[PDB]
Structures are given as C-alpha cells and as structure tokens.
Amino acid sequence: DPYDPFPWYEKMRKESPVYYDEDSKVWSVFLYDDVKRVISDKDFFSNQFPFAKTMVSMDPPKHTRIRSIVSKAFTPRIMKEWEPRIRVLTDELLGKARGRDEIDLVQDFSYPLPVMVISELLGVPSEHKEKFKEWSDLLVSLPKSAYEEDVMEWRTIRNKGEEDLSAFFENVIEEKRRNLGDDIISLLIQAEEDGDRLSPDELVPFCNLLLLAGNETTTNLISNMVYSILEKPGTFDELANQPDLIPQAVEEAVRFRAPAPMIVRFVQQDTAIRGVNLKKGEGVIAFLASANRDEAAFERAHEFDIHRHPNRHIGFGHGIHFCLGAPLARLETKIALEALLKQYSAMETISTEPMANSSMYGLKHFRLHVKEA
Ligand code: HEM
Structure with a gap:
C-alpha cells in the first residue's frame, strides 16, 4: 500500500536514522530531532541549490527581505478579513453535490477548493476561473518518465504554461495599481518595508509560488484529514458534537498524514548529525512525515488524537522558511471540515486511490457514501 509508508519510516528511524543512498549520493534523515535541525539550522543547511526566482530557494539576507514583505499578506487580521469568502466558496462546492449519496471528496471538493480560494484571494477575476485552473494544473504537473525525450516534452509545455500565467498575473498587478482592492496582489502592491517594495519581477513569481505551494498541499491535507477522521470510529461524530476541536484536528492531520x-x-x-559527518555540498532529504510519526517526540505517535494540544509537529516546517501560507491552509482546512460536518450527518469510506508521487502524500480518488442531514 503506497498510502501506508509509515512502517518503512519506523524501520528507518530505528535501523538507519541517518541514511546515505550510494546510488543518488544524497543523505536521508528520519528522526524528529534530526529532521527538525536540518530544516531550521540555516547556517549549516541551505535552501540555495544551483522556484529559482522565489524565496524557497533563497538564504538570508535575500530571503529575509522578501519574507518580511510578503508576510504582510498573511497576518491574522488579513486572514479574518478573508474567512467569509472561503466559506462562500466551500458552500458553493458542496451545494453542487446536493442530492447525491456518493461523492468523490477529491474531485468534488478537496481538489477544486484551494484553486478556487487562491484565485479569489489573489484578486483574479472569477471570470477566468477555468483558464486559471488549467495554468495551475500545468504548474503542479510532473513528467511521466525521467528520460530526456519525456522531460523535454513536459518542460516545454509547463514553460509555456508558466509564461502565460506570468503574463496573466502581470496584467492583474497592473490593473490593481489603478483600482486597488481587498486581495493579496493589492496588498503586496502597497506593502512596504521602510520604502522597500516588491518589484513586478518578484511579485509575479511569488504568485506562481502560492499556487505551486498551496494548491495540492491543501488538497492532500483536506483529503488526508477526512480519511483519518473516518479511519477512527466515532471521530466524525465527536467533531460534530465539539466543533471547537476542529483546529486541533487540523493540526493533528498535518502531524498524522x-x-x-x-x-x-x-x-x-x-558538520555532523548524530555522529554522521556530512560534507559541504551534499543534499539532505528531511522526512517531515517520519519526524511527525516519531515516538520519541509524540505520545502514541501511530494514533490519530484530536485532543493533542499544543501540537509540536513540523509538517509546516520550522525556522525562517516556516510555511508562509500555514494561516491560510489552517483556515481553509478548518472551514472545509465545518462545511462537511454541517452538510452530512454521516460519511463512510467506499474506496480510496492514493497519489503515488514521491514529494506528495495524498489521494487521487476518495469515493464516499454520504447522508445529508
Ligand atoms: C497543508 C498545507 C501546506 C503544507 C503542509 C505546507 C508545507 C510547507 C513547508 C513544510 C514549507 C517549508 C519548505 C522549506 O522549508 O523548504 C512551506 C513553505 C511555503 N509554503 Fe506551505 N504548505 C501548505 C500550504 C500552503 C499554502 C496554502 C500556501 C500559500 C497560499 C503556502 C505557501 C508557502 C510558501 C510561500 C512557502 C515558502 C516559505 C519560505 O520560503 O519562506 N503553503 N510549506
């Protein structure tokens, strides 16, 4: 089962916490404390690997400047300003599924929602929603094979997709400068740090980064959360009878899956981790999924506990690169679960089809049997 790689993580935590793959010459780390240090010890572990124009591949001070500016678009105040809009979009998705006793949580809910949400938060007119989805799908696409002929064909089509989306955002930015609104692009136009502002050359890649970093991740979080709730008899009902536990359930879903x-x-x-010496220039793969399942870090790490509070997981990272969109992912996932708990008195998993992507843990299909309340 590709949706259950936890037994392997556990084998690697106890027999090879610090693993070196001779075929790829890249290190692997699986224990919570070591994964946490690799992702946060900036002085020893770098984000620069010569995505390229974004802060994800930057180290201080270049990262610090951009991080300090774009963080003004994800403040708690700004999030509360946008909570109503996310609720409307979520209600509209579920409304399209009324009058059905089977739905596919992914294709009917968790996959569409993030893309719809980020376009309305960025200030993209809703009338381009179907051409916005295509570009966003192209952005997160992968080649089917690793051979030159396949990667070359895929790269050329994503390149043209990224260029058209870039030109599209450049037009939205230009329009918002004259008619500013209540959205991310408008906020970043007027965002200023002692006169320092984001350039057009920086804003455009950043808006692509929001789609690339927020769409599939949030989709997988919602699907994995609903799956883990229905995996534990009584949790669905427990969440509907104590709705104030949903935020804690969101965090537990980031830890669990x-x-x-x-x-x-x-x-x-x-430097050295756990006694294993690492030379400058080597790549380290920090397994957050394994860190969040570490028994040395969490009590009953193999069980989904919606009462865990505070949750010290590192599914959003740790350090200066801590997920910029975590406030939005948390709010979106909370609202998605509330909308499901209110529309359905009961849900039952029929069948699941997991996503077999290396750098992503989620489901491509999640067919359910539902009962509207
Ligand atoms: C469940 C949902 C999500 C998860 C698990 C997640 C996870 C992460 C993690 C682990 C990082 C750190 C990467 C690193 O340190 O190299 C990160 C960075 C980032 N994420 Fe998220 N993310 C989620 C949703 C989102 C959303 C909704 C957005 C924006 C709309 C977003 C935008 C970003 C950005 C811009 C960064 C780069 C931060 C920086 O380099 O300073 N993410 N994310």
Missing part, C-alpha cells in the same frame, strides 16, 4: 512528506536542504558547512 503530512501532505508534504519531505523537504530538501543542502549542506552549507561541514
């Missing part, structure tokens, strides 16, 4: 299993860093200075 991390949508982004692994994070990459490059060794910046010679």
Whole structure:
C-alpha cells in the first residue's frame, strides 16, 4: 500500500536514522530531532541549490527581505478579513453535490477548493476561473518518465504554461495599481518595508509560488484529514458534537498524514548529525512525515488524537522558511471540515486511490457514501 509508508519510516528511524543512498549520493534523515535541525539550522543547511526566482530557494539576507514583505499578506487580521469568502466558496462546492449519496471528496471538493480560494484571494477575476485552473494544473504537473525525450516534452509545455500565467498575473498587478482592492496582489502592491517594495519581477513569481505551494498541499491535507477522521470510529461524530476541536484536528492531520512528506536542504558547512559527518555540498532529504510519526517526540505517535494540544509537529516546517501560507491552509482546512460536518450527518469510506508521487502524500480518488442531514 503506497498510502501506508509509515512502517518503512519506523524501520528507518530505528535501523538507519541517518541514511546515505550510494546510488543518488544524497543523505536521508528520519528522526524528529534530526529532521527538525536540518530544516531550521540555516547556517549549516541551505535552501540555495544551483522556484529559482522565489524565496524557497533563497538564504538570508535575500530571503529575509522578501519574507518580511510578503508576510504582510498573511497576518491574522488579513486572514479574518478573508474567512467569509472561503466559506462562500466551500458552500458553493458542496451545494453542487446536493442530492447525491456518493461523492468523490477529491474531485468534488478537496481538489477544486484551494484553486478556487487562491484565485479569489489573489484578486483574479472569477471570470477566468477555468483558464486559471488549467495554468495551475500545468504548474503542479510532473513528467511521466525521467528520460530526456519525456522531460523535454513536459518542460516545454509547463514553460509555456508558466509564461502565460506570468503574463496573466502581470496584467492583474497592473490593473490593481489603478483600482486597488481587498486581495493579496493589492496588498503586496502597497506593502512596504521602510520604502522597500516588491518589484513586478518578484511579485509575479511569488504568485506562481502560492499556487505551486498551496494548491495540492491543501488538497492532500483536506483529503488526508477526512480519511483519518473516518479511519477512527466515532471521530466524525465527536467533531460534530465539539466543533471547537476542529483546529486541533487540523493540526493533528498535518502531524498524522503530512501532505508534504519531505523537504530538501543542502549542506552549507561541514558538520555532523548524530555522529554522521556530512560534507559541504551534499543534499539532505528531511522526512517531515517520519519526524511527525516519531515516538520519541509524540505520545502514541501511530494514533490519530484530536485532543493533542499544543501540537509540536513540523509538517509546516520550522525556522525562517516556516510555511508562509500555514494561516491560510489552517483556515481553509478548518472551514472545509465545518462545511462537511454541517452538510452530512454521516460519511463512510467506499474506496480510496492514493497519489503515488514521491514529494506528495495524498489521494487521487476518495469515493464516499454520504447522508445529508
Ligand atoms: C497543508 C498545507 C501546506 C503544507 C503542509 C505546507 C508545507 C510547507 C513547508 C513544510 C514549507 C517549508 C519548505 C522549506 O522549508 O523548504 C512551506 C513553505 C511555503 N509554503 Fe506551505 N504548505 C501548505 C500550504 C500552503 C499554502 C496554502 C500556501 C500559500 C497560499 C503556502 C505557501 C508557502 C510558501 C510561500 C512557502 C515558502 C516559505 C519560505 O520560503 O519562506 N503553503 N510549506
């Protein structure tokens, strides 16, 4: 089963916490404390690997400047300003599924929602929604094979998709400068740090980064959360009788079934983890999914506990690169679960089809039997 790689994570935590793959010459780390240090110890583990124009591949001070500016678009105040809009979009998705006793949580809910949400939060007119989805699908696409002929064909089509989306965002930015609104692009136009503003050359890639970093991740979080709730008899009912536990259930879902299993860093200075020496220039794969299942870090790490509070997981990362969109992912996932708990008195898993992507843990299909309340 590709939806159950936890037994392997456990084998690697106890027999090879610090693993070196001779075929790829890249390190692997699986224990919570070591995964946490690799992703946060910036002085020794770097994000620069010579995505390229974005802060995800930057180290301080270049990262610090951009991070300090774009963070003004994800403040708690701004999130509350947008909570109503996310609820409307979620209600509209579920409304399209009224009068059915079987739905596919992915294709009918968890996959569409993030793309719809980020377009309305970015200020993209809703009248381009279907051409916005195509570009966003192209952005997160992967080649079917690793041979030159297949990657070359895929790269050329995503390149043209990224260029058209870039030109599309450049037009939205230009329009918002004259008619500013209540959206991310408008906020970043007027966002300023002692006179320092994001350039057009920086805003456009950043808006592509929001689609690339937020769409599938949030989709997988919602699907994995609903799956884990229905995996434990009584949790669905328990959440509907104590709705204030939903945020804690969202965090537990990021710990239990991390949508982004692994994070990459490059060794910046010679150092050692757990006694294993690592040379400058080597790649380290930090397995967040395994860190969040570490029994040395969490009590009953193999069980889904919606009462765990506070949750010290690192599914959103840790350090200066801590997920910029975590406030939005948390709010979106909370609202999605509330909308399901209110529309359905009961849900039952019929069949699941997991996503077999390396750098993503989620489901491509999640067919359910539902009962409207
Ligand atoms: C369940 C949903 C999500 C998960 C698990 C997640 C996870 C992560 C993680 C682990 C990182 C750190 C990567 C690294 O340190 O190299 C990260 C970075 C980032 N994420 Fe998220 N993310 C989620 C949703 C979102 C959303 C909804 C957005 C935006 C709309 C977003 C935008 C970003 C950005 C911009 C960064 C780069 C931060 C930086 O480099 O300073 N993510 N995400």
